[PDB]
Ligand SMILES: *Cc1c(COP(=O)(O)O)cnc(C)c1O
């Protein structure tokens with residue numbers, strides 16, 4: 001059977017690694033993958049997680065199976081973090097959440113539930129968007145249509161074109177929104193812009209699917225949730241897939257959740273059982289470690305306070321590197337205004353680079369950026385900040 | 397969209413929990429789920445894993461993403477544990493393995509790879525078999541046909557009927573074999589019987605898919621692998637899905653692997669990339685914790701020695717409870733020969749009970765067994781062994 005088999009192509013992001021990693025070149029700079037990197041260029045494990053991990057080590061008595069939906073406590077916390085502390089969705093029992101292996105596994109679990117218990121056959125994903133999106137949905141048999149998003153000339157959210165590609169989306173179709181820190185543009189809708197998409201969506205009969213993979217990285221944990229919350233106030237049904245990989249630095253432990261809100265308790269209970277049936281057929285129940293770490297930190301007021309401070313530092317370091325980037329460029333010799341990257345948020349930014357400029361840095365200079373022209377700012381330090389803006393003014 | 401939605405039915409195994417758990421009855425006995433239980437009725441975390449876990453805690457420097465296939469070291473070990481220390485499949489580079497979220501996730505990853513890169517459309521699964529099998533494969537779009545297996549009268553492997561249901565399986569179809577400790581019968585083929593299925597399968601053009609979820613629980617770690625190894629000696633292509641949940645007591649951490657052997661290096665490399673593409677579309681990369689625990693124990697000669705001793709004790713306790721069961725029954729008052737359960741292996745056994753006897757114990761007696769008449773012997777202690785055989789001679 002395997003004699004026919006065609007080789008799979010490169011993952012748009014993860015293929016660059018084996019080129020930096022395997023580049024035997026000395027003075028490199030990575031700037032590719034969306035994994036945070038501190039002042040020293042290390043991706044350390046948070047202090048609050050080290051503390052929750054010795055705690056688990058002292059207290060775990062069994063490795064016995066978690067429920068299909070996982071740790072109850074982890075469920076509750078994800079809900080409060082998302083909908084708010086006194087949220088009516090929580091009070092009316094309209095939300096149900098399942099712990100999943102990553103934000104990607106919550107996306108896929110949403111995919112398989114929709115693709116077999118529902119009308120939907122089409123998912124609208126922005127242009128551009130996180131590459132693996134299309135691939136997850138298509139794997140469920142659904143098809144990916146892409147509304148417009150970004151003004152390649154003004155480096156902003158082309159709102160009009162956004163609305164003007166969305167009306168082609170008919171009712172009972174799913175529209176996918178990045179909750180905060182849009183991957184890869186970093187451009188996010190204003191609150192007014194969300195209050196608008198909220199009504200166009202209620203009026204047009206859409207099913208919103210929020211991808212929350214960076215809560216806390218744009219402005220705050222509550223601020224970054226205002227859009228989802230604006231949509232959750234007027235829709236009776238919506239789903240949200242979230243990830244704790246980047247905001248807790250728990251990347252390789254695979255922790256995320258897929259919450260489903262329905263019109264009421266009876267419906268979300270009944271719809272959740274099918275979501276559960278979907279999980280039981282994929283991976284049987286979720287991995288305990290990274291989830292219990294998150295449940296412990298969030299449940300304990302001493303540990304949680306350290307966690308938010310750590311998140312606040314990661315956020316404040318990226319916010320500082322962005323400014324270091326636009327200034328060093330302005331000093332190294334640039335005939336181009338990169339001030340827009342200062343207005344963008346999260347770990348990523350779309351430089352104004354062509355696929356041939358990206359290739360010119362990577363070859364003649366060893367600096368690595370996805371062909372997309374996307375550079376991870378949380379991978380710039382004050383130390384590498386100089387050979388970086390030198391390479392960029394050379395290629396400009 | 398969710399107003400239509402039909403409630404999902406009960407999982408054949410996991411629905412009984414909420415009935416024992418939620419049974420407010422006092423003198424209970426569970427006997428349902430396939431999770432080991434020691435002399436005290438506790439599912440403790442192994443000593444060798446507690447030791448590997450403090451080790452990870454002292455040494456982990458980052459929670460950064462694992463490769464799509466996971467921990468290399470974990471890959472190598474799974475191969476040697478399966479194929480053997482000086483195995484030619486390993487030496488010729490014909491094997492490739494991906495770490496997955498459980499044995500169930502290795503089954504599913506096999507499913508999705510086959511269902512989209514291959515000819516196969518049918519999977520042969522024994523009668524009976526682990527319930528979730530059918531459900532995983534059907535989820536991939538494939539269909540489940542079931543060959544015969546068990547002689548409900550002689551409590552053995554009906555070999556002839558086995559062969560006589562298998563010829564209907566045409567070439568390019570997948571036949572699924574339990575490597576050791578057949579769930580739920582506990583009846584396993586002899587080595588001669590495997591050397592026979594090995595040639596019928598090479599002669600008929602089948603694709604073997606081994607489900608290894610209990611290596612070490614029948615006779616040993618190497619002994620329990622003789623069948624797979626007999627098949628791997630004469631087939632050029634085969635896949636095997638294994639789980640470390642029960643044999644390392646790592647249930648809720650989701651650790652298993654999906655190995656793929658092809659005719660040669662070039663083919664397995666090329667076929668593996670597609671397997672990888674399948675993973676990247678499900679859950680992005682695997683969970684690190686439970687896998688690194690397994691890699692550490694197996695890599696270290698001091699830790700490994702404790703691990704095998706622990707496995708040896710679990711194995712020897714079940715082997716003793718089986719004998720306690722046939723003897724206590726023979727003394728409590730039984731007009732039936734249960735000696736067959738002494739000849740069966742692993743955690744499970746098919747009592748000779750009717751769905752109405754199972755229901756009679758569970759109601760009038762609080763003893764819980766799946767309607768299947770399957771009782772987990774690794775859930776019997778010398779303490780509960782008496783009200784157990786009393787209930788069974790009452791219902792007989
Ligand atoms: C990182 C990311 C995710 C999910 O990542 P997981 O590692 O699988 O949690 C989802 N969406 C976007 C835009 C992301 O950047």
Ligand SMILES: *Cc1c(COP(=O)(O)O)cnc(C)c1O
Nearest residue numbers: 284498499500526579609639641
């Ligand atoms: C337990 C089991 C598996 C896999 O279980 P995971 O918890 O997902 O590893 C596979 N096959 C059988 C027969 C089993 O009993």
